[PDB]
Amino acid sequence: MSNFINIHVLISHSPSCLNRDDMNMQKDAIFGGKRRVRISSQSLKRAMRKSGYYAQNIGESSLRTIHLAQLRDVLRQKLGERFDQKIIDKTLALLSGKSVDEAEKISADAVTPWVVGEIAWFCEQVAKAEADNLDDKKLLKVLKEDIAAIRVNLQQGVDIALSGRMATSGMMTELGKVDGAMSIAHAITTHQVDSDIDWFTAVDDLQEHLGTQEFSSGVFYRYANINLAQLQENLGGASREQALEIATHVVHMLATEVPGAKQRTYAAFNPADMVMVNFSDMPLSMANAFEKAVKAKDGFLQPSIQAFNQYWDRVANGYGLNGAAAQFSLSDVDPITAQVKQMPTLEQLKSWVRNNGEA
Amino acid sequence: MSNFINIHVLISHSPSCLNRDDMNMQKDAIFGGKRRVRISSQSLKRAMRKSGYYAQNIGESSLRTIHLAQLRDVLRQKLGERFDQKIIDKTLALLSGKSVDEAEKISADAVTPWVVGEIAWFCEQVAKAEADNLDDKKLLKVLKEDIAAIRVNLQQGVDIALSGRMATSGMMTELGKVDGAMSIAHAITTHQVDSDIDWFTAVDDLQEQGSAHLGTQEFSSGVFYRYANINLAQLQENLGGASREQALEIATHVVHMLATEVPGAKQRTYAAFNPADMVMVNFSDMPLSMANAFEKAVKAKDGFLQPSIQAFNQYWDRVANGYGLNGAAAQFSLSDQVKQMPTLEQLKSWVRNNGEA
Amino acid sequence: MSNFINIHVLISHSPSCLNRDDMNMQKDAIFGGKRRVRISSQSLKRAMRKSGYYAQNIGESSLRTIHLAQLRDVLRQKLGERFDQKIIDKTLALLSGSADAVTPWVVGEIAWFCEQVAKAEADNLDDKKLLKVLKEDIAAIRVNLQQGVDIALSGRMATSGMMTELGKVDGAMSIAHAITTHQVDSDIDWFTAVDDLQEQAHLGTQEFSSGVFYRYANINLAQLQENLGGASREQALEIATHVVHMLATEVPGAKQRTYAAFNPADMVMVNFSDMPLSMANAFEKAVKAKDGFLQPSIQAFNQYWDRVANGYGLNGAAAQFSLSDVDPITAQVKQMPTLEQLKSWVRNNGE
Amino acid sequence: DEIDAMALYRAWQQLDNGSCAQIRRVSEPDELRDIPAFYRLVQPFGWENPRHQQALLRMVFCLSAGKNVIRHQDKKSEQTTGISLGRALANSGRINERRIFQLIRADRTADMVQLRRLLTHAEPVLDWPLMARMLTWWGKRERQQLLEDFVLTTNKN
Amino acid sequence: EIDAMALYRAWQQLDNGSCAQIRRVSEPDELRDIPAFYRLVQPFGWENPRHQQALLRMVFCLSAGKNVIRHQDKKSEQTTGISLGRALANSGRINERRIFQLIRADRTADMVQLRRLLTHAEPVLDWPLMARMLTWWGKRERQQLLEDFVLTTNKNA
RNA sequence: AUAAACCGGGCUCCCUGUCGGUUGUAAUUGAUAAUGUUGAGAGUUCCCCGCGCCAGCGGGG
């Protein structure tokens, strides 16, 4: 069975500014010696994480913070009916490596992802360890013996199972180190973009000074893959089918979710025009299809999709890629040759993915 | 027959940061007076060594460490069924030159490569020596006799056969010196690169951050020229006198990996899983790199990839004619005296068959 | 028919470190007031002498053996005024257990041995004990007599056993330090050592750079012929050919397993002369980069030649082999498509 | 012989809003050559002498960040020169060191673009004729001196 | 190179039928569809492909009329004569935005607009200089046209 | 054939793991491109062939 699942997406956006930096400038990148517009992988990740679809098909997002005071209070309110305050405080203090007073500000080393399910589990363990006069060190060494038992709790924090976590303080260094299952790339345009500039003003209704905003439209190449085995491992040993279902939701989200930036004023609410999913032993990206920046003819979209299809033909024949592959597209013109099953709707695609690429 | 095999790769990466330095800036190098982006040789090496292709087609990889306590416990664990605990401890001690207590902290002199197969073999030898109440320095005397018998074990440690090992303490200092059979160059881009910067933040779900200073991460894309050669004879020697066929086999695996493996750095957040767009293999009596093809840095025209491939091919023609290089050569390319190969597997086969299939 | 052969080479190395000092820092030199990376005379010469090409075409030459039998007559009347024929013939017989010329280091060492034999005759020392005293020296010279061409070209090994003053054998080929045609921007690599058993770091540094190097060498044909027992100019030119090939292909071995700067030279010019001259002043004013360092370096070379060659009296057959098609050099210098053709050209004295 | 910097400065300050607007639209120094208002601006200041063109193109380009983005301030009578560009950029508290890093390593044209972004972002206070000399030469030495001044300032302040 | 004053003198002495027939084109390449053109420009090296594009441009401008472009030799003092932009500015008939939109006008859009300007302005100028400008016609020759126009207009006022 | 000659400073090594730059904003009001002008004249139209009363007529390019 194939371990890696690759998700390729071509999605065209109308004039927008979906990701910018500390100087209100669009994020770009250089590719093939020409400037592409860029949407950072962080942006995509958090857009997916916090989306509504995630909330309805995957669950609650992890709670990412650095303020342990607020976190203390939160954990009390959401767990108080299950544990003594002092078990909670002690668990937080052991995980974080800081002391949980009634101090107003208590800051961790960095912004870390916390999962309330996980913290609860640790609270149980700390409780029985409290009842047994077991010392903190021995508690640690004990817990280190069965890691999977802790990773099961990441089913209430699937995003962490996808993008991972690092720790530099507390027992989390030994316990809460998670290795991301999903690799995801910055989205870049398949063509050159010279951004436009909107010169604006604000009218003062009581009297009778121009600002600027950079923007652009563009056809974007999104890529991500998922390491099934590592996902299963990161979820406590979950099934391949549960893995495939999560991977499916990631396909959906990568084909429909869009960062929120400047959207109320530019509304680039576009859906993907092509989505290909492809099963593989070694993960590969199709970015090179657009190393030679796509030149427009009757748009950027069609030539980008054709460029994609061609590169995939060359790479698949050249490197002998026998893996399940399927392509959904809103365009009619000529797709990838017959080893790529065509999908009329996105849902048929997603079914085909849920079914390990055989349906 | 030719002793050397040359592997050239042109591979193009999308935005990414495949190797960085002490300030977390992309590793670079100056070539032709212009800045290229660099992926170091050690990085490529470790990339291949820890890969899954390696694990499934070559075998186990060396274990590099300095913590003889941890290594102790590991070795006990995977050899306990064949050897006594202090046979194991003894062997470890004699090879490391440090006394193997039941201490929980025992430092070697430096991070060194440990092949488990090798250590098992030395375990058999030390067992023998223990049965005959033999003195250590005499066991050493005996073992210096037949070094090939020890190098035969590097077939379960091919990575050291390829990249070599230097020894500083214990019997290894006498028995362990391996001269690498594979020479491999730092990957550099065939073109000038001005690196981009990503300015990121972290949204704190419990406080609406206002003014903030954004973190930075240098990144870039680029067309890299990878080069490595393998000295077949020295491989054969490092493997205990292995046949040429086995050498060529391993060489073929090195070709594959050099054409497909990409270092792991920041790949979770930049995803540059690109295969190579050109692989050429070239048998020779004297190794020679094609790096000078890009000394005059490639200027872009419809990308950097194709112009690079053509620069490569042209320098290849000029050097082949200029220095009269009639040796088996083959080139695999994705783009529309050198035998052309449609697929990577045909190239690999060609290599396996000493360059005439 | 000039005495000296001059060899000039321009070779470009990709990022590497072909030669460093006691502080593991790349070797240095100031020229024209600006710093150039250097590869030492020593390093390069060793690169050549320990090569396989050298081994097969110098260490396994026909002229490599010196037969003492054929050297009896000439030896004896080159040594007749110092020694009686008895002592001579005894000595030569000891060493070994038609020709009219003899290499001076031979004459010298033979002389020393002779002296010893006479010395031992005066004390009626037993022959067995005599040999027992100078076993070593015998072995030595028996070795050196098997490596004629090698010694003629490169000189004596650093451990040779040569005793005399005529035994201080200079190489027929003189090899200069190689320096870059341009000022160099040196790079610094920062590496670590991952401990596969505690990956939870201590960094080390290695300096490295890329550059266009000017290699220069000369060959003293007369000296070669003399130290081969009076061999012909054709043969000496053969040897010269081999040295040209090597200076164009052989590269020092330092850190090449991890930096692999396995590059062939891009320009090779051979030039006959009465006075051997380096063209290093072509680069006294350091080359500035313009689409690389290679082309401008080559151009600077060519134009230096044009400017000073005849004035400096480099009137003698001259040929140039080069991969880069930059503005050609004076009509009088013959172009060569292949190294092999340049070699053949040298082999036949330059026409 | 030498270019008047202060004159050009004041000229840029008193320019009519339309012309300023027309100049503020270049995205690259050489585009200034596509713009009538530019030639009208630099004509008094020796544009017609080829020696001063590149220089002028840079000056104006940086000024073209805004009508008062570059606040000039005279040096103190005591010290020999006024505030350097690097120092001012550092003094603003809005410029991150890596920006300067990537600035001094940028190719021609690109560096000026980046510089102008930094100037809009910082609104530096500096000795303008000094910066003008710097732009007049703008080579390795000057880029390096920029980063050095930045670093040492940020160090003490 | 191409002899200019020769081509001019040939154009001045062309027969009115050929002359009117040439004027009628609406795009330089349409000259290729006309015999009189070939006979005109053959003595001046049309047969050499290097010179072709150039000639097509030159004649096209000349096609404005037999006496629209008035040549005037440079004064011995001056190093160069009256360039096109100066001539146009001197006409008083051309609006700055015509010139601006001229230099920003695409291959081809460009020559058509220039010819319209020429007929409208009937400029007196050093013809061989114009010819050179037309021989190369790249970004900087266009930008130079705008320069001369703007700067002359400012000078004269 | 010079404090010279002969004459490697040389072997080993991931810089790795975590991170929306985000919220808000008419460029807006005024403005003929306007006055004057035969396209007239003029049978040349370059080649092959047929016929001719050598005035021209016709076939083919």
Helical spans, DSSP H, in chain A: 41-50, 52-57, 68-79, 85-96, 116-131, 136-143, 148-151, 158-163, 172-175, 228-234, 240-256, 263-266, 301-319, 346-354
**Six-digit token string for B204:** 């704190």
Query: Inter-chain contact B30–C197, Cβ cutoff 8 Å?
Result: no
Rounded CA separation B147/C228 (Å): 41
Nucleotide nearest to B204 (CA to C1'): F19
Rounded CA separation A251/D38 (Å): 52
User: Is the sign of the CA dihedral C166, C171, C175, C177 positive or negative?
Assistant: negative
Pairing state between β C334-336 and C318-322: parallel
Rounded CA separation A149/A160 (Å): 16
Of B194, B213, B218, the CB nearest to D96: B213
Q: Is C4 helix (H, G, I), strand (E, B) or coil?
A: strand
Whole-angstrom CA distances from A240 to A181, A235, A348, B259, D53 are 13, 11, 19, 30, 68
Torsion of CA E139, E140, E145, E148, to 10 degrees: 150
The answer to whether residues B186 and B226 touch, using CB atoms and an 8 Å cutoff, is no
The answer to whether residues A222 and A254 touch, using CB atoms and an 8 Å cutoff, is yes
The answer to whether residues C155 and C171 touch, using CB atoms and an 8 Å cutoff, is yes
Preferred mutation among D95, D98, D108, D151 to probe B, highest tally of B CBs within 10 A: D98
Q: How far is the CA of C253 from the C1' of F7 (A)?
A: 16
Name the phi and psi angles at A214, rounded to 5: -80, 140
| Nearest of B62, B86, B48 to residue B228 by alpha carbon | B48
Name the phi and psi angles at A115, rounded to 5: -120, 125
User: What string of DSSP letters covers B149-189?
Assistant: HHHGGGGG-HHHHHH-B---STTHHHH--B--SEEEPPEEE
Q: Is C310 helix (H, G, I), strand (E, B) or coil?
A: coil
State the amino acid at position C279 in one-letter form.
Answer: M
Please report where in the chains the tokens 């109308």 appear, as a residue. A14
Helical spans, DSSP H, in chain C: 41-49, 52-57, 72-79, 85-96, 104-122, 127-133, 135-144, 148-153, 221-226, 233-249, 256-259, 294-308, 339-347
Q: Is A350 helix (H, G, I), strand (E, B) or coil?
A: helix
CA angle C334, C339, C342 (to 5 degrees): 40
Name the phi and psi angles at B261, rounded to 5: -80, 140
In terms of residues, how long is chain E? 157
Burial (0-12, 13-18, 19+ Cβ within 10 Å), C128: exposed
**Six-digit token string for C197:** 């058993």
- B12 vs A contacts (CB less than 8 Å): 288, 291
Query: Inter-chain contact D106–B192, Cβ cutoff 8 Å?
Result: no
Non-local (6+) Cβ contacts of C136 within 8 A are C161
User: Is the sign of the CA dihedral A85, A89, A94, A96 positive or negative?
Assistant: positive
The answer to whether residues C270 and C346 touch, using CB atoms and an 8 Å cutoff, is yes
Rounded CA separation A315/A282 (Å): 13
Name the phi and psi angles at C240, rounded to 5: -50, -45
Task: For chain B, say whether A321 makes contact (Cβ under 8 Å).
Answer: no
Helix axes C135-144, C104-122, angle to 10 degrees: 160
Instruction: Name the minimum distance, in Å, from the CA of B323 to any CA of chain D.
Output: 37
Non-local (6+) Cβ contacts of C350 within 8 A are C270, C272, C316, C317, C318, C319
**Six-digit token string for C118:** 């006479």
Residues 140-199 of A with CB under 7 A from strand F: 163-166, 168, 180, 198-199
Rounded CA separation A319/B342 (Å): 9
Whole-angstrom CA distances from A322 to A276, A283, B85, C164 are 15, 13, 48, 76
Residue A73 neighbours by CB distance under 10 Å: 12
- Tally helices (H) and strands (E) across chain D: 9, 2
Q: Do chains D and C touch (3 or more CB pairs under 8 A)?
A: no
Q: Is A143 helix (H, G, I), strand (E, B) or coil?
A: helix
The answer to whether residues B25 and B216 touch, using CB atoms and an 8 Å cutoff, is no
State the amino acid at position C109 in one-letter form.
Answer: E
CA angle A120, A125, A130 (to 5 degrees): 120
Residue D103 neighbours by CB distance under 10 Å: 22
State the amino acid at position E102 in one-letter form.
Answer: L
CATH architecture group of domain D1-157:
Orthogonal Bundle (1.10)
Q: Is the CB of B163 under 7 A from strand F?
A: yes
Residue C104 neighbours by CB distance under 10 Å: 15
- D102 vs B contacts (CB less than 8 Å): 194-195, 197
Q: How far is the CA of E24 from the C1' of F40 (A)?
A: 19
| Nearest of A337, A19, A38 to residue A186 by alpha carbon | A38
Q: Is the CB of B199 under 7 A from strand F?
A: yes
Long-range pairs, C121-130, Cβ under 8 A, ≥24: C121/C87, C130/C94
Instruction: Name the minimum distance, in Å, from the CA of D79 to any CA of chain B.
Output: 34
Query: Inter-chain contact A25–D117, Cβ cutoff 8 Å?
Result: yes
Q: How far is the CA of E119 from the C1' of F35 (A)?
A: 20
| Nearest of B221, B198, B261 to residue A291 by alpha carbon | B221
| Nearest of C326, C318, C324 to residue C346 by alpha carbon | C318
Pairing state between β A107-114 and A63-67: antiparallel
Rounded CA separation A349/A329 (Å): 10
Pairing state between β D71-72 and D125-126: parallel
**Six-digit token string for A16:** 């927008």
Pairing state between β B215-231 and A34-39: unpaired
Find the helix or strand (DSSP H, E) in which B247 lies.
Answer: helix B244-260
| Nearest of C228, C222, C100, C221 to residue C152 by alpha carbon | C228
Non-local (6+) Cβ contacts of E119 within 8 A are E64, E65, E68
Query: Inter-chain contact C198–B46, Cβ cutoff 8 Å?
Result: no
- C338 vs B contacts (CB less than 8 Å): 321-324
Rounded CA separation A54/A250 (Å): 9
Burial (0-12, 13-18, 19+ Cβ within 10 Å), A182: buried
Q: For chain B, which residues make up each domain, given as ranges?
A: 1-357
Pairing state between β A34-39 and A28-31: antiparallel
Compute CA B267 distance to the chain's CA centroid, rounded to the nearest angstrom: 19
Rounded CA separation C276/C292 (Å): 30
Torsion of CA D77, D81, D87, D88, to 10 degrees: 60
Residues 44-63 of A with CB under 7 A from strand F: 45-46
| Nearest of A322, A320, A358, A340 to residue A274 by alpha carbon | A340
Non-local (6+) Cβ contacts of C307 within 8 A are none
The answer to whether residues C187 and C13 touch, using CB atoms and an 8 Å cutoff, is no
Instruction: Name the minimum distance, in Å, from the CA of B91 to any CA of chain D.
Output: 52
Rounded CA separation C115/C121 (Å): 10
Rounded CA separation A75/C174 (Å): 81
CA angle D127, D130, D132 (to 5 degrees): 110
Q: Is B56 helix (H, G, I), strand (E, B) or coil?
A: helix
Residue B20 neighbours by CB distance under 10 Å: 18
Query: Inter-chain contact B323–C264, Cβ cutoff 8 Å?
Result: yes
Nucleotide nearest to B202 (CA to C1'): F19
Whole-angstrom CA distances from D23 to B139, D29, D147 are 86, 10, 28
User: What string of DSSP letters covers A155-201?
Assistant: GG-HHHHHH-B--SSSTHHHH--B--SEEEPPEEESS----EEEEE-
Q: Is B342 helix (H, G, I), strand (E, B) or coil?
A: coil
Closest-CA residue of chain A to D118: A23
Pairing state between β B215-231 and B276-284: unpaired
DSSP state of C194: -
Compute CA C230 distance to the chain's CA centroid, rounded to the nearest angstrom: 20
Residues 13 through 52 of chain A touching chain D, CB cutoff 8 Å: 23, 25
Q: Is E53 helix (H, G, I), strand (E, B) or coil?
A: helix
Instruction: Name the minimum distance, in Å, from the CA of B204 to any CA of chain A.
Output: 5
**Six-digit token string for C312:** 């400096």
Rounded CA separation B257/B337 (Å): 25
Instruction: Name the minimum distance, in Å, from the CA of A206 to any CA of chain B.
Output: 30
Whole-angstrom CA distances from D139 to B28, C36, C183, D23 are 21, 22, 17, 25
Q: After which residues is chain A broken (C to N over 2.5 A)?
A: 208
**Six-digit token string for B170:** 């214990």
| Nearest of D11, D8, D46 to residue E151 by alpha carbon | D46
Q: For chain D, which residues make up each domain, given as ranges?
A: 1-157
Closest-CA residue of chain D to E102: D34
Provide Rg for chain E, Cα atoms.
Answer: 15
User: Is the sign of the CA dihedral D67, D68, D69, D70 positive or negative?
Assistant: positive
- A184 vs B contacts (CB less than 8 Å): 268-269, 271
Rounded CA separation E4/E10 (Å): 10
Non-local (6+) Cβ contacts of A310 within 8 A are A289
Please report where in the chains the tokens 């306590």 appear, as a residue. B69
Preferred mutation among A31, A228, A231 to probe B, highest tally of B CBs within 10 A: A31
Task: For chain D, say whether E143 makes contact (Cβ under 8 Å).
Answer: yes
Q: Is A82 helix (H, G, I), strand (E, B) or coil?
A: coil
**Neighbouring-strand partners of residue C272:** C5
Q: Is A7 helix (H, G, I), strand (E, B) or coil?
A: strand
| Nearest of C179, C153, C149, C147 to residue C243 by alpha carbon | C153
Residue E76 exposure: Cα atoms within 13 Å on the Cβ side: 0
Query: Inter-chain contact B194–D98, Cβ cutoff 8 Å?
Result: no
Closest-CA residue of chain B to C321: B322
Please report where in the chains the tokens 């342990």 appear, as a residue. A68
Pairing state between β A187-189 and A34-39: antiparallel
Task: For chain A, say whether D117 makes contact (Cβ under 8 Å).
Answer: yes
Rounded CA separation C257/A340 (Å): 44
Rounded CA separation C126/A297 (Å): 103
Task: For chain D, say whether A212 makes contact (Cβ under 8 Å).
Answer: no
Q: Is the CB of B211 under 7 A from strand F?
A: yes
Residues 246-285 of C with CB under 7 A from strand F: 252-258
Burial (0-12, 13-18, 19+ Cβ within 10 Å), B214: middle
Maximum CA pair distance of chain A? Answer: 77
Rounded CA separation B84/B65 (Å): 23
**Six-digit token string for B122:** 């030395």
**Six-digit token string for C184:** 């160099």
| Nearest of B307, B305, B261 to residue A289 by alpha carbon | B305
Name the phi and psi angles at D16, rounded to 5: -70, 145
User: What string of DSSP letters covers B264-297?
Assistant: -TTHHHH---PPEEEEEEEEESS----GGGGSSP
In terms of residues, how long is chain B? 357
**Six-digit token string for B214:** 């954004």
State the amino acid at position B58 in one-letter form.
Answer: I
Nucleotide nearest to A112 (CA to C1'): F18
Provide Rg for chain D, Cα atoms.
Answer: 15
Q: Is A64 helix (H, G, I), strand (E, B) or coil?
A: strand
Non-local (6+) Cβ contacts of B141 within 8 A are none
**Six-digit token string for C345:** 């050209």
Q: How far is the CA of B64 from the C1' of F12 (A)?
A: 11
Please report where in the chains the tokens 């857009």 appear, as a residue. A47
Find the helix or strand (DSSP H, E) in which C284 lies.
Answer: none
Rounded CA separation C91/C97 (Å): 10
Of D34, D40, D48, the CB nearest to E143: D34
User: What string of DSSP letters covers A312-342?
Assistant: HHHHHHHHT----EEEEES--S--S-TTSEE
Burial (0-12, 13-18, 19+ Cβ within 10 Å), A253: buried
User: Is the sign of the CA dihedral A249, A250, A253, A259 positive or negative?
Assistant: positive
Non-local (6+) Cβ contacts of A229 within 8 A are A3
Burial (0-12, 13-18, 19+ Cβ within 10 Å), E100: middle
Rounded CA separation C144/C34 (Å): 44
Q: Is E83 helix (H, G, I), strand (E, B) or coil?
A: coil
**Neighbouring-strand partners of residue A20:** A26
State the amino acid at position E59 in one-letter form.
Answer: V
Rounded CA separation D6/C319 (Å): 61
